[PDB]
Design a protein around this ligand. Sequence first.
Ligand SMILES: O=C(O)CNC(=O)C(=O)O
Ligand SMILES: O=C(O)CNC(=O)C(=O)O
Ligand SMILES: [Mn+2]
Ligand SMILES: [Mn+2]
Lengths: 402, 395
Amino acid sequence: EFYQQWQLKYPKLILREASSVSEELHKEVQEAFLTLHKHGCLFRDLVRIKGKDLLTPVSRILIGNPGCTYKYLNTRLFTVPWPVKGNIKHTEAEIAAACETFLKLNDYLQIETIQALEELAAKEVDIKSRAAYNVTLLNFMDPQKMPYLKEEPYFGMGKMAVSWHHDENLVDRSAVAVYSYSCEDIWHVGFKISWDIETPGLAIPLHQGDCYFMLDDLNATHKHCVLAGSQPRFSSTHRVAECSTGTLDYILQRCQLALQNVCVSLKSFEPAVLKQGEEIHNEVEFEWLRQFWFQGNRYRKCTDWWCQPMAQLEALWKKMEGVTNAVLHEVKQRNEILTAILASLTARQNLRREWHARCQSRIARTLPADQKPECRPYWEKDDASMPLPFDLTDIVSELRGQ
Amino acid sequence: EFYQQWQLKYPKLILREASSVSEELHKEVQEAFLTLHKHGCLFRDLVRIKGKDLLTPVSRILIGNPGCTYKYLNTRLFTVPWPVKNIKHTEAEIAAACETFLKLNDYLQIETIQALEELAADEVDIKSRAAYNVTLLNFMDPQKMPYLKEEPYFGMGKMAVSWHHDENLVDRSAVAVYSYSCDIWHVGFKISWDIETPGLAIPLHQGDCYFMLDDLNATHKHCVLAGSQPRFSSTHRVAECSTGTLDYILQRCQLALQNSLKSFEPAVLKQGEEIHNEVEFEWLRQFWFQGNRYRKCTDWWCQPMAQLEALWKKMEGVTNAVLHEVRNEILTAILASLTARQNLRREWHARCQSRIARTLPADQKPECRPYWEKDDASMPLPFDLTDIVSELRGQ
DNA sequence: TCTATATCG
DNA sequence: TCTATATCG
Ligand SMILES: O=C(O)CNC(=O)C(=O)O
Ligand SMILES: O=C(O)CNC(=O)C(=O)O
Ligand SMILES: [Mn+2]
Ligand SMILES: [Mn+2]
């Protein structure tokens, strides 16, 4: 908060001053943050942290590899594809130029990471892996527009734009690189040991152009925050999101895996395969379709990439609904199928209420028309095309009798 | 939340129906909950979980072995002693209740060790794992409390205590709970990190008791769905009291006092200032912050706290010694405990002047002791508010 | 692998 | 061994 003694620190957390980037890059990436901001591609996420619905003070945009997603606090952010070698389409060509810029920024920081990681080993296959960023989450805020910021509760570090947390959904021991852009009373990033409360935390100053890296298991052993300054500030947090079971290819393949048991008639009713089938059904429904509809569609203002695959995933989902109706008709002795799918159906019910709630929640009505969440897939009992109804319990209670 | 097949349930958790404990015991413990309520010995705690100040919907009191304490969410509750062999209870009736909850503790302890044995299909651990040293008594009236958070995962309705873990427990320790429902109360259970598995809500009927054994408390999270009538409850548990009993803090103080110092060896001064911080923020401030309310019931802690205060004052005198003295490795060896002192000092001063801490009735208002303005002569050193650390900070 | 728990009027 | 966030700080 004052003119502090915080430079002496110790690395697993390395800091690299503005003087390390070509300045050729600075203008390009700062212009990318400015164009992205003016077109209105940065939005606040309507997270649901522990049962509570919360808007994030900072406004962000997930950019990265096409087909990749990052789930963070029950919300799954979808990547605006960046032009990775091999061609994708964006709305306006400004946004596409910026996604190009961040893509080269990603490669640059990545190089710096592998190097700093070699320097650290002095105390090889794994590293390259651990420094292979696949996404970057961009943030922005304007401290003079937030009516009230929370206040760091342990070292009187003042207001904070992002409270003590951990970066989530990352490959084990993976590093994270952050480029800070304070516009032209100073911003700082806080770091602290995760469980101790009596060890003074570190606030390291972030000036226009400074970059800081978190290496190895620092993000897991420590928690960090972002203390606010007096001017507005941008930032690109490049990460290597653990995207197994998190890419479009993965969910498509599963779908084909669940649909392999249907020639609506199913090729077999072995309780284990049906279990998987209804679980994959739930996964594509609540982990992809509802989320996208809930918050992804705002990205539609920046890219069309997700329009057709989501629709495919919706068709696939409808077919599962038809297999669900089929198995339900088969139970109209051996009730191992009954004690193999009731949990996935009741879970699908609760998750359906939870999402339905988040959608029509008090906070969710506080944002722009184009951003308000849609509760798709949704359908009233009078729809004929749908095999089953948006459940609301009559069916599970019937299955429960046994 | 209606008649269901939920009773059909599993193994590392046991419910024992009202019909298994003696009616002489139920009347005794039920009368104890009523007397404790009438005397106004149940207060809500002004916890500060993770930096935020919150009042607890349920009202509780910690009763147990003399000299024991239980830390829960940054608040340390002090035990009003229950008779075990010298007790100074303020009112006869409160002392009678603590005697009954002492026999309840023994009883539940026996059933617990039993059920722990039966679950096997050495044996000293089991006994240690079921040696309850404290009990946290709870009461609430759902009518009085209009809006109670709603269970966010299985539509189990309102909750008097959200999904959590019982903390400050010996590893692998069991917990026994006696429920007193005077529209039914339920206890929720679910796998901890698991959000797609439907949770279990077990009905709780006047006189029912449920036990949590082995890791269950660590692998799962439980809650308390509220009913329509008011309810009491005794959660007998074995706090992992080492480092949380008076004898421990007293010895540390003495340990601290063995130094007009006897030595400025960088290691011993470090540990000395650490003991200073521990006694300052983990006993004195907690007792006067949240401790003072229990004097309505018991005066046991008046005697030891005051000794802890006087002694600490002496530790302040040791600090004054070290600041006058300060090659300077006795500087890069004490900065963490003093800066920690500074922050913890703000933290407590804050909890003190918070809105919720200001709205309480006179009996429960938090006291920010030890506190003194610069003007006070007696204290060798001040209440920080920087300067010393800043001066100390250089190089 | 829950847990970044802020509509400041 | 944070994390039971139901009183605007
Ligand atoms: O921008 C920063 O300095 C820090 N941002 C984050 O920690 C994040 O987005 O996870
Ligand atoms: O009273 C009950 O059934 C549950 N109470 C608790 O979980 C508790 O106080 O830790
Ligand atoms: Mn982060
Ligand atoms: Mn509990």
